[PDB]
């Protein structure tokens, strides 16, 4: 995704 931590 565009950023980390999204799952």
């Amino acid at each position: 995704a565009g950023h980390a931590g999204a799952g």
């Epitope: 980390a4 931590g5 999204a6």
Partner: antibody, heavy 116, light 114 residues
Framework: VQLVESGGGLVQPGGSLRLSCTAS????????FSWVRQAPGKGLEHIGY???????FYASWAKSRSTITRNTNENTVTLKMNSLRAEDTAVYYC???????????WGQGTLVTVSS | DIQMTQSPSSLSASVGDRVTITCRAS????????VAWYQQKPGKAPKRLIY???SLYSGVPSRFSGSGSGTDFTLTISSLQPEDFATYYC?????????????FGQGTKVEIKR
């Protein structure tokens, strides 16, 4: 598209700061938002990041005192930091940092002075 | 935990010179791409110039450019102008699917020789 910041100002040591940023022209739930601070004449320091999915991750130095939340109903994101010391005096910003994406939004910043 | 080291911490250059600022990451950034460059002028808020290592924001003059790979990144001002006096920061994004962090470099003050 705007991000208006509110709160802060003069806070006493050992007290707490509460800062909010109200989105206008979009919904807070659609982007991840960081909180960053900058002491007078120093560099930028990252506090914590609230992903678009609602998960909060904090830098180590800030983990024990910081809480970052968001209210989808009021369309706002909020930082709370307690046990404040003079070392916490800084300009605080809410910001989608846009490290790898074309979208980047910053609040105007607000100086928080920790003093009695 | 995560660190980014800029160099130099300050520099002095003349109008028209080419300025290079490097930023060194302690780990790999997210997707080897989430690195942005910011510019802060006196009394102003930081303004983003570059994102995704090398993408120029539409509001920024084209004499700014980004480059780099792996954990070493570079911001380049091709022809230095007086209004380019500022402190420049790299910012990196890090973590995994269950971790998300940002880290700023300590900043590079660019002074104008005159």
């Amino acid at each position: 598209v705007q991000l208006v910041e509110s709160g802060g100002g003069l806070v006493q040591p050992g007290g707490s700061l509460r800062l909010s940023c109200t989105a206008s022209g979009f919904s807070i739930d659609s982007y991840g938002f960081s909180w960053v601070r900058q002491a007078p004449g120093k560099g930028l320091e990252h506090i914590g990041y609230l992903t678009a999915g609602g998960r909060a991750f904090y830098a180590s130095w800030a983990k024990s005192r910081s809480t970052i939340t968001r209210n989808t109903n009021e369309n706002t994101v909020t930082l709370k930091m307690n046990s404040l010391r003079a070392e916490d005096t800084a300009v605080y910003y809410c910001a989608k940092l846009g490290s790898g994406n074309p979208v980047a939004i910053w609040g105007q910043g607000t100086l928080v002075t920790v003093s009695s | 935990d995560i660190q980014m080291t800029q160099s130099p911490s300050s520099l002095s250059a003349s109008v028209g010179d080419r300025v290079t600022i490097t930023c060194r990451a302690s780990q790999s950034v997210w997707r080897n791409k989430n690195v942005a460059w910011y510019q802060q002028k006196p009394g102003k808020a930081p303004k983003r110039l570059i994102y995704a290592i090398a993408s120029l924001y539409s509001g920024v003059p084209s004499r700014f450019s980004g480059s780099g790979s792996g954990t070493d990144f570079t911001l380049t001002i091709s022809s230095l102008q007086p209004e380019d006096f500022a402190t420049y920061y790299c910012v990196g994004h890090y973590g995994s699917e269950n971790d998300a962090y940002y880290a700023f470099g300590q900043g590079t003050k660019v002074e104008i020789k005159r």
